[PDB]
């Protein structure tokens, strides 16, 4: 058993400095988290202003660092010197990043029912993640028979999602996959004619 | 919230493996390559817009190693509990025959940050043009990772992403083939 060799015990330490931003940079919270294996042990929360043990294993560290007044002063000012600074560094290509989805409609290769057409709307390559993907039959929004995969992160600063609709095609109908997204001022639409 | 920037670091023993990366809303801005001692931007344009002094990351990593060893002794060498990954294979766009595409191996919810990923084409390892991300942090302090294989879709080829991890008794084998 075991899918990999070298099964010696492992020991992991993680440090996470989280800058949380509300309403641009009007409200900023710094959360410094120290994690041993899978358990946070001590943290500095800028809303608190000093280190606090999260587990007992972290109590000695909170006590020692809280005795170091230069460190505390630097960490308390980090919401400005660190969080707001780094926010301004990348604001134009992160906060303001907008990438338009590509929208494709096709029948599923799975067609389980005669006189039905299972349609797939693929929405790929977009940023940020907030999106609406909606099916229409003529001018009528379809709410029944819709399944979505939800957001999928691709790892390259784009997302994709898949939304399917079971249809009973009738002559004269047009089915539209319509996408609302911050990258476009008018919705993207792609049509499948019955 | 609207947005979060995370400076995420780790050190792992006995591997002597470190990582330093910046994260914006769950995507990687950059990491520092520990071997080349250089900043690696996740998207090429990022390196035209911004800079980061790699030596700052290396200095923190040395402290992380020291703190790891203190915590290892303080816990009486309590080791990490392996958590095996969840794996999904998908394409970055709808597949058309003979139109270049990319296979994505999506590896999620695992720790420690050590994994082995092999792309197989028709059961044979393939490496041409493959690429991968470093370990991305999760709020539950597990990790996520992406591996990529550019490919030319065809009706004859099949693919598998094979993922191995200390938490897996057997390798995970996730299949993809043309949806004919």
């Amino acid at each position: 058993m075991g899918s990999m060799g070298d099964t010696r015990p492992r020991f992991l330490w993680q440090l996470k400095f989280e800058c949380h931003f509300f309403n641009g940079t009007e409200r900023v919270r710094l959360l410094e988290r120290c994690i041993y294996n899978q358990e946070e042990s001590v943290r500095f929360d800028s809303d608190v202003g000093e280190y606090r043990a999260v587990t007992e294993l972290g109590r000695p560290d909170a006590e020692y660092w809280n005795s170091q007044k230069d460190l505390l002063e630097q960490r308390r000012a980090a919401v400005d010197t660190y969080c707001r600074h780094n926010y301004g560094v990348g604001e134009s290509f992160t906060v303001q990043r907008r990438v338009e989805p590509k929208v494709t409609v096709y029948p599923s290769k799975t067609q389980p029912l005669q006189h039905h057409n299972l349609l797939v709307c693929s929405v790929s390559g977009f940023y940020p993640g907030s999106i609406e993907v909606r099916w229409f039959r003529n001018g009528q929004e379809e709410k029944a028979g819709v399944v979505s995969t939800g957001l999928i992160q691709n790892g390259d600063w784009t997302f994709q999602t898949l939304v399917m609709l079971e249809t009973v095609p009738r002559s004269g109908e047009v089915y539209t996959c319509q996408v609302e997204h911050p990258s476009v001022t008018s919705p993207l639409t792609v049509e499948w004619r019955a | 919230e609207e947005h979060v920037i995370i400076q995420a670091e780790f050190y792992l023993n006995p591997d002597q493996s470190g990582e330093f990366m910046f994260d914006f809303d769950g995507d990687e801005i950059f990491h520092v390559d520990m071997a080349k001692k250089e900043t690696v931007w996740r998207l090429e344009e990022f390196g035209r817009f911004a800079s980061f002094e790699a030596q700052g990351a290396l200095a923190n990593i040395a402290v992380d190693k020291a703190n790891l060893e203190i915590m290892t002794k303080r816990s009486n060498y309590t080791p990490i509990t392996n958590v095996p990954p969840e794996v999904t294979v998908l394409t970055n766009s709808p597949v058309e025959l003979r139109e270049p595409n990319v296979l994505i191996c999506f590896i999620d919810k695992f720790t420690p940050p050590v994994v082995n990923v092999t792309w197989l084409r028709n059961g044979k390892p393939v490496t041409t043009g493959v690429s991968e991300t470093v370990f991305l942090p999760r709020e539950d302090h597990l990790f996520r990772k992406f591996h990529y294989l550019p490919f030319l879709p065809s009706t004859e080829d099949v693919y598998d992403c094979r993922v191995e991890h200390w938490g897996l008794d057997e390798p995970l084998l996730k299949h993809w083939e043309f949806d004919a």
């Binding site: 440090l15 400095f17 410094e32 000695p60 560290d61 020692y64 660092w65 170091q68 460190l71 960490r75 980090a78 010197t81 660190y82 600074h85 780094n86 560094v89 990348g90 | 400076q7 670091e9 330093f20 910046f22 801005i29 950059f30 817009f49 911004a50 800079s51 980061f52 002094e53 700052g56 990351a57 200095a59 923190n60 402290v63 992380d64 020291a66 703190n67 203190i70």
Partner: peptide, 14 residues
């Protein structure tokens, strides 16, 4: 330069 700043990590009590 347009520079990301890191926060420095500090050791436990020496």
């Amino acid at each position: 330069f347009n520079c990301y700043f890191p926060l420095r990590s500090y050791s436990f009590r020496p």
